[PDB]
From a paper:
Intact MS screening against [name]-BD1 has identified five fragment hits with >1% target labeling, and we could verify the binding sites of two of them by peptide mapping performed by LC-MS/MS following tryptic digestion. [name]-BD1 was mostly preferred by PhP053 (6.7% vs. <2%). One hit, PhP053 was successfully co-crystallized with the protein, providing further evidence of binding in the primary (AcK) binding site. Other binding modes, including one in a secondary site for PhP053, as well as the AcK site and a third site (residues 156-163) for PhP072 were modeled with induced fit docking, considering the sites of labeling, as verified by peptide mapping. In the newly identified, surface-exposed sites, PhP053 binds via multiple H-bond and π-π contacts to the Y65 and K160 sidechains, while PhP072 occupies a neighboring site by multiple H-bonds towards K160 and E163. In addition, each of the two hits that were further verified by peptide mapping, PhP053 and PhP072, have labeled an alternative binding site in addition to the main one. We should highlight that the orthogonal, secondary binding assays (X-ray crystallography for [name]-BD1, HSQC NMR for KRasG12D and MST for STAT5B-NTD) were carried out without irradiation, verifying the affinity of the fragments towards the respective targets via a non-covalent mechanism of action. For the highly tractable [name]-BD1 target, both libraries provided fragment hits against its primary binding site (nine primary hits for PhABits and five for PhP).
[name] is a member of the Bromodomain and Extraterminal protein family, and has important roles in the expression regulation of oncogenes, as well as the maintenance of genome stability. As a tractable protein target with thousands of reported ligands, we have first screened the PhP library against the first bromodomain of [name] ([name]-BD1). Maximizing the coverage of the experimentally validated set of binding pharmacophores at the fragment level, here we report a pharmacophore-optimized photoaffinity library (PhP) containing 100 fragments with diverse binding pharmacophores, equipped with a diazirine-type photoaffinity tag.
Author numbering: 42 to 168
């Protein structure tokens, strides 16, 4: 039931950019979800020890969370918006895969995902 090292948030040789779409992903998308009453389970990697989920990392092999995403955005880790959008979708999908319909954690993810979809719908044109 040990925890893996977190997903990478720093890699100097990896290519990155600062673009208007990525700026929107930080200023609008992340900020909106981060402040939500249901954000707290998703603000850091799943701690399988603390949450007593010893099978978690036997099932979820591409873990993702908003703490990781926040650091990726703030530390200019990404090349493009698609990469960051994929991280959010991974985070939601992991939750749905591991858990059961109507679990509280799933209801929480669904509420965050609703807002995510609304904001991604208005992702600005690349400048
Ligand atoms: C609501 C609950 C208690 C029950 C619980 O641990 N369920 C499993 C679980 N899946 C998760 N996916 C992402 C983040 C946290 C997660 N926890 N406190 N998390």
């Amino acid at each position: 039931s040990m925890n893996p090292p977190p997903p990478e948030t720093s890699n100097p040789n990896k290519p990155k950019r600062q673009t208007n779409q990525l700026q929107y992903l930080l200023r609008v998308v992340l900020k909106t979800l981060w402040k939500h009453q249901f954000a707290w389970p998703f603000q850091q990697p799943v701690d399988a020890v603390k949450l007593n989920l010893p099978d978690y990392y036997k099932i979820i092999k591409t873990p993702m969370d908003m703490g990781t995403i926040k650091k990726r955005l703030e530390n200019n880790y990404y090349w493009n918006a698609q990469e960051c959008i994929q991280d959010f979708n991974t985070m939601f999908t992991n939750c749905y895969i591991y858990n059961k319909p109507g679990d509280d954690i799933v209801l929480m993810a669904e509420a965050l995902e609703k807002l995510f979809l609304q904001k991604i719908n208005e992702l600005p044109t690349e400048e």
